[PDB]
Amino acid sequence: MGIFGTLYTGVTGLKASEVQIATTGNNISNANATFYTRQRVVQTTNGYITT
């Protein structure tokens, strides 16, 4: 990947943790918002790019 997108991608890894953990705490908050079904966050990638 390009350097700037590359180091940006690491931020995505940080963002993934951020969004994931935010979701985890949310689920933890949902531990008695008992109506909450499992909402899921899934890995993707920034798509194919010219190189």
Next chain:
Amino acid sequence: MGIFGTLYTGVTGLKASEVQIATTGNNISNANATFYTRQRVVQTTNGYITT
């Protein structure tokens, strides 16, 4: 004087140094997107004779 031409040719060899910037940056690229397959390096055989 002609040997001066060798010098810019050496720079072309130096540009072979740049790819390992590209490789290291590209190789590092795959953060935990759990769907990846590597791409890997090569070295070549050669032989040269004179009259």
Next chain:
Amino acid sequence: SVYSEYQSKSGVNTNEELAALIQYQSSYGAAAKIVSTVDQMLDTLLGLKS
């Protein structure tokens, strides 16, 4: 039975999310120092351009 049947695959509890958090515990911990490492390395090539 059916009433009890909304607290293992659908809703919420302890542990399952906690295990996820700890994976994320690793996730950012690795991500950040990887990121800063990369930044420090940008600097190396920059000094190389010199």
Next chain:
Amino acid sequence: SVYSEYQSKSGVNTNEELAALIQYQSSYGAAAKIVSTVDQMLDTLLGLKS
């Protein structure tokens, strides 16, 4: 079982490659300066012949 094996087969890592490959360049960059160093011999010869 089949699960376990692939995760080993999924061996595609990226981190430590950073340390090795940057230097293969940086060595050349650290060489490029000496390349100039001996290159500048030509420059100085030119200045002399001026």
